[PDB]
Amino acid sequence: LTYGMMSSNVYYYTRMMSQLFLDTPVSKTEKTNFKTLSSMEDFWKFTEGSLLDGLYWKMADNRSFIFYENLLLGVPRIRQLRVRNGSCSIPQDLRDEIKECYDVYSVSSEDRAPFGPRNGTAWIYTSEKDLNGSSHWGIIATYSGAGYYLDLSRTREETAAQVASLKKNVWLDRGTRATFIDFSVYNANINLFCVVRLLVEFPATGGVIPSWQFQPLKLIRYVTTFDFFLAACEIIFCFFIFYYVVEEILEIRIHKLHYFRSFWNCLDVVIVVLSVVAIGINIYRTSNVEVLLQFLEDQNTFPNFEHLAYWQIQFNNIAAVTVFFVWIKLFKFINFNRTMSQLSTTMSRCAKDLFGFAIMFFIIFLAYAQLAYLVFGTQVDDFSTFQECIFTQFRIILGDINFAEIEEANRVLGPIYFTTFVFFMFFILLNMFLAIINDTYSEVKSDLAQQ
């Protein structure tokens, strides 16, 4: 199943599109691209520049093939989310030199009124239900599926005019909070769709934060004999899961009513739970494809393919974790001689002490992480979030750190932090694990030899 799900190299399929849309400079004389956007004017340059160059290619109203192979499906869609004016509360002291104020994004503070030249859908709020959207969970916040949207055209000449009209009448104010661009391609050579989403966030403190997503999909599965082979293998997998859950129920029914003190029964139930969740996700995902049929009915509209990509990502994560745990389960059978038995006994005997020491190790780790977050968390950006501090410490353990960037953030208490962390991590905490393991292994081996 895993080797079939990773077919011929779709990595190159993703990489070509990523390089076309992200690494291309927004125009000839400037060197900024989508990954290094820094202002709203740069976003406008990108929209009328590299975006149109990549979207529309030359061969009456003929279609566009991105690499002469990837067919652009329908039309791309642009969308924006903005907030209301006066949604914050300024102090009465400065209520003369400051008139307008916009808060951070939130469903309580979002705008729903027409603005500017109220002509079409680009200047009128559209509800999430009427737009068939959903949340995104961006970098700064979680944005809704509503907003002000516009559908572009199938040719470059009309899309350019539409974007120029959107730029002339001011469509991006300082009340704008987020912007989305969505489209999809097919590439009939290998039957695999691609969904492209680009997000640009405008935080209330100023600046621009870009992000992207290129997701390959497969929605016309049964085309070749290998697809039928994969379907048969999926059916066999479902039968195997049913047999395993039946056996687990039989073994939990009466025999060994407690059944939880083995650490292998827990692994088995974890595997079964993950497998049934994956099966349910797959069944709910492949049986909901009315979007494809609706698009195929009329191919001059926006193909709505984000839910499929989201569920594909979820299924991929679940399958990866399930495969990892299934492979880990192999330890239940490697006891074919006396050498592996004593190693497994050593591990099982020392686990209870390793946990007790790992509690202290992680308490000290979190103390260091919170100190780093509170001290360097506003200047370094490797410590801007708590989880980022944890990852930064794990990288410091490997030596993948830049000490100069934290030395200048704090002349004192920075070198102290680095020196103490390295010293107490490599001289004390690392060696206690070795002490425990060596004592347990020696005790087990001596006990076995003497007995």
Partner 1 sequence: SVLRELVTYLLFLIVLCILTYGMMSSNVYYYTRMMSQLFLDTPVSKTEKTNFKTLSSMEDFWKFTEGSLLDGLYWYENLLLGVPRIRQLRVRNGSCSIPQDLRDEIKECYDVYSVSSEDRAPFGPRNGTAWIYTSEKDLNGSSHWGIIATYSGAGYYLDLSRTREETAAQVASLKKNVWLDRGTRATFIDFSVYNANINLFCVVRLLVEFPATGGVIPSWQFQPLKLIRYVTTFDFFLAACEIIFCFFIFYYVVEEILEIRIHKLHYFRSFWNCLDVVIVVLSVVAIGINIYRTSNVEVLLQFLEDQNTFPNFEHLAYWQIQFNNIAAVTVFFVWIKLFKFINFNRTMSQLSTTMSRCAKDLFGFAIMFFIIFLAYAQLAYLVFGTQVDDFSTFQECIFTQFRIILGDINFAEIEEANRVLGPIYFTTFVFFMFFILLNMFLAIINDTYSEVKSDLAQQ
Partner 2 sequence: VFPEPTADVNYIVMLTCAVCLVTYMVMAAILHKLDQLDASRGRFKYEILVKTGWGRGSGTTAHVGIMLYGVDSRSGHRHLDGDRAFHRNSLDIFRIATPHSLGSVWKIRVWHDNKGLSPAWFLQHVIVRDLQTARSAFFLVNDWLSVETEANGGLLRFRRLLVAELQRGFFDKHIWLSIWDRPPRSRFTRIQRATCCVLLICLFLGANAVWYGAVGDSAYSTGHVSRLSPLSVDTVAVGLVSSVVVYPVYLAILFSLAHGLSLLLVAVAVAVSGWVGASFPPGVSVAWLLSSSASFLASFLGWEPLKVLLFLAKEEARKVKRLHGMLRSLLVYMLFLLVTLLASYGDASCHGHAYRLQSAIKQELHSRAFLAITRSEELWPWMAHVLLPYVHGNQSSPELGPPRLRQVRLQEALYPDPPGPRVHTCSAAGGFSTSDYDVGWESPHNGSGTWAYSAPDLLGAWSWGSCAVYDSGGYVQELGLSLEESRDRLRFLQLHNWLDNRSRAVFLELTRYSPAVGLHAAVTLRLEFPAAGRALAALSVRPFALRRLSAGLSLPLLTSVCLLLFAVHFAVAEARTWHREGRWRVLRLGAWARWLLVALTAATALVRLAQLGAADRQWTRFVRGRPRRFTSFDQVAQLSSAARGLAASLLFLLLVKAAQQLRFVRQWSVFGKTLCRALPELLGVTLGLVVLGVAYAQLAILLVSSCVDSLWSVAQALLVLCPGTGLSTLCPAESWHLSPLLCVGLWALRLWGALRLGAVILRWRYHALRGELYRP
Ligand X SMILES: *[C@@H]1O[C@H](CO)[C@@H](O)[C@H](O)[C@H]1NC(C)=O
Which residues contact ligand X by CB under 6 A? 85-86, 99-100, 117, 119, 130-132, 169
DSSP string, 144-183: -S-BEEEE--SSHHHHHHHHHHHHHTT---TTEEEEEEEE
Cβ neighbours around 373 below 10 Å, total: 19
Interactions with Ca ion, residue window 94-133 (CB under 5 A): none
430 annotated binding-site participant: no
- Number of DSSP helices (H) and strands (E) in the chain, helices first: 15, 5
State the nearest-atom distance from the C-beta of 438 to partner 2, in Å.
5
Which of residues 206 and 399 has its CB atom nearest to partner 1 in the complex?
399
Map residues 38-67 to x or -, x wherever contact with Ca ion holds by CB under 5 A.
------------------------------
Q: Which does 169 bind (CB under 5 to 8 A by kind): ligand X, partner 1, Ca ion, none?
A: ligand X
Burial of 21 (0-12, 13-18, 19+ CB in 10 A): buried
Give the binding site for partner 1 (CB under 8 A): 2, 6, 9-11, 14-15, 214, 216, 316-317, 319-321, 323-324, 327-328, 330-331, 334, 340, 343, 346, 354, 387, 390-391, 394-395, 397-400, 430, 433-434, 437-438, 441-442, 445
SS3 2: helix
Per the CB < 8 A criterion, the answer to whether 204 and 213 are in contact is no
Which of residues 268 and 306 has its CB atom nearest to Ca ion in the complex?
268
Q: Of these, 268, 272, 306, 393, which contacts Ca ion (CB under 5 A)? A: 268
398 annotated binding-site participant: yes
Per the CB < 8 A criterion, the answer to whether 440 and 349 are in contact is yes
State the nearest-atom distance from the C-beta of 274 to Ca ion, in Å.
15
Phi, psi (degrees; rounded to nearest 5) at 80: -140, 150
Cα atoms in the 13 Å half-sphere on the side-chain side of 240: 11
CA atoms of 200 and 218, how far apart (whole Å): 27
Cα atoms in the 13 Å half-sphere on the side-chain side of 188: 5
Under rule CB under 5 A, residue 306 binds Ca ion: no
Q: Which does 268 bind (CB under 5 to 8 A by kind): Ca ion, ligand X, partner 2, none?
A: Ca ion
Q: Which does 114 bind (CB under 5 to 8 A by kind): ligand X, partner 2, partner 1, none?
A: none
* Consecutive H or E run containing 449: helix 430-450
Which of residues 181 and 369 has its CB atom nearest to partner 1 in the complex?
369
The residues pairing with 211 across neighbouring beta strands, listed in sequence order, are: 199
Q: Which does 381 bind (CB under 5 to 8 A by kind): partner 2, partner 1, Ca ion, none?
A: partner 2
State the nearest-atom distance from the C-beta of 167 to partner 2, in Å.
18
Which of residues 167 and 395 has its CB atom nearest to partner 1 in the complex?
395
Q: Which does 117 bind (CB under 5 to 8 A by kind): partner 2, partner 1, ligand X, none?
A: ligand X
Q: Give the pairing of strands 148-151 and 176-185.
A: unpaired
Which of residues 231 and 413 has its CB atom nearest to partner 2 in the complex?
413
List Cα–Cα distances, 71 to 4, 56, 324, 339, in angstroms. 25, 10, 36, 59
Q: Which does 266 bind (CB under 5 to 8 A by kind): Ca ion, partner 1, partner 2, none?
A: none
CA atoms of 405 and 376, how far apart (whole Å): 10
Binding site for Ca ion (CB under 5 A): 268
Task: Please give the annotated binding residues, written as ranges.
Answer: 314, 398
